[PDB]
RNA sequence: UGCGUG
RNA sequence: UGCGUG
């Protein structure tokens, strides 16, 4: 929810492929917690994964 | 160490393929903790994995 | 090395 | 669904 919004803001401000480690630094939660949301967002066609462990708005 | 010995005893007393969930019940530690040792034991040719998430003496 | 796993 | 990941 708040984490979902933070992930969306980081991906949108970046505008390009973002590595999971870079999201950890910006979102201040562990990789597993990020990936739970990222894969849910992916299912929802809110984000895309152009590369392994790499995420973008899509 | 003690967990390694417990895993070895459970696999040897069983004598056949053992599922990771069955090891959890006997060894009273989580699947990740079991798998850390199991894959180290596998590297050491002390156990084998005849099937995914399935383990035996080998 | 991808790991999200329930 | 394999997950051991450092």
From Swiss-Prot, chains A, B:
Q: In which tissues is it expressed?
A: Expressed in lung, spleen and liver. Lower levels were seen in heart, kidney and testis. Expression is greatly up-regulated in tumor stromal cells and activated macrophages.
As recorded in Swiss-Prot or TrEMBL, the protein's gene is named Zbp1
| Source organism of the structure | Mus musculus (Mouse)
- What does the UniProt PTM comment say about this protein? Ubiquitinated; polyubiquitinated following influenza A virus (IAV) infection.
> Could you tell me which residue ranges the Z-binding domain spans?
1-58
Q: Which compartments is it annotated to reside in?
A: Cytoplasm; Nucleus
Job of this protein:
Key innate sensor that recognizes and binds Z-RNA structures, which are produced by a number of viruses, such as herpesvirus, orthomyxovirus or flavivirus, and triggers different forms of cell death. ZBP1 acts as an essential mediator of pyroptosis, necroptosis and apoptosis (PANoptosis), an integral part of host defense against pathogens, by activating RIPK3, caspase-8 (CASP8), and the NLRP3 inflammasome.
Domain comment (free text): The Z-binding domains recognize and bind left-handed double-stranded Z-RNA structures, but not A-RNA, the right-handed double-stranded RNAs that are structurally very different from Z-RNAs. The second Z-binding domain (also named Zalpha2) acts as a molecular switch regulating pyroptosis, necroptosis and apoptosis (PANoptosis). The second Z-binding domain is essential for sensing influenza A virus (IAV) Z-RNAs.
Q: Describe its partners and assembly state.
A: Homodimer. Interacts (via RIP homotypic interaction motif) with RIPK3; leading to RIPK3 activation and necroptosis; interaction is enhanced by CASP6. Interacts (via RIP homotypic interaction motif) with RIPK1. Component of the AIM2 PANoptosome complex, a multiprotein complex that drives inflammatory cell death (PANoptosis).
What is the superkingdom listed in this entry's lineage? Eukaryota
Name assigned to this protein? Z-DNA-binding protein 1
Q: Could you tell me what induces this protein? A: Expression is activated by IRF1. Up-regulated following interferon treatment. By lipopolysaccharides (LPS).
Give the phenotype of cells or organisms lacking this gene: Mice are resistant to necroptosis, characterized by a decrease in epithelial cell death and an increase in virus replication. At a modestly lethal dose of influenza A virus (IAV), mice display significantly increased rates of mortality, probably caused by a failure to eliminate infected cells and limit virus spread in pulmonary tissue. Perinatal lethality observed in Ripk1 knockout mice is rescued in knockout mice lacking both Ripk1 and Zbp1. Skin inflammation observed in Ripk1(mRHIM) mutant mice is abrogated in Ripk1(mRHIM) mutant mice that also lack Zbp1.
Q: Please tell me which positions the record assigns to the cross-link Glycyl lysine isopeptide (Lys-Gly) (interchain with G-Cter in ubiquitin).
A: 6, 32
Q: Which residues of the full protein are shown?
A: 12 to 69 of 411
């Amino acid at each position: 929810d708040n984490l979902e919004q933070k992930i969306l803001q980081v991906l949108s401000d970046d505008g390009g492929p973002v590595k999971i480690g870079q999201l950890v630094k910006k979102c201040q939660v562990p990789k597993k917690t990020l990936n739970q949301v990222l894969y849910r967002l992916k299912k929802e066609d809110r984000v895309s994964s152009p590369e392994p462990a790499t995420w973008s708005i899509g």
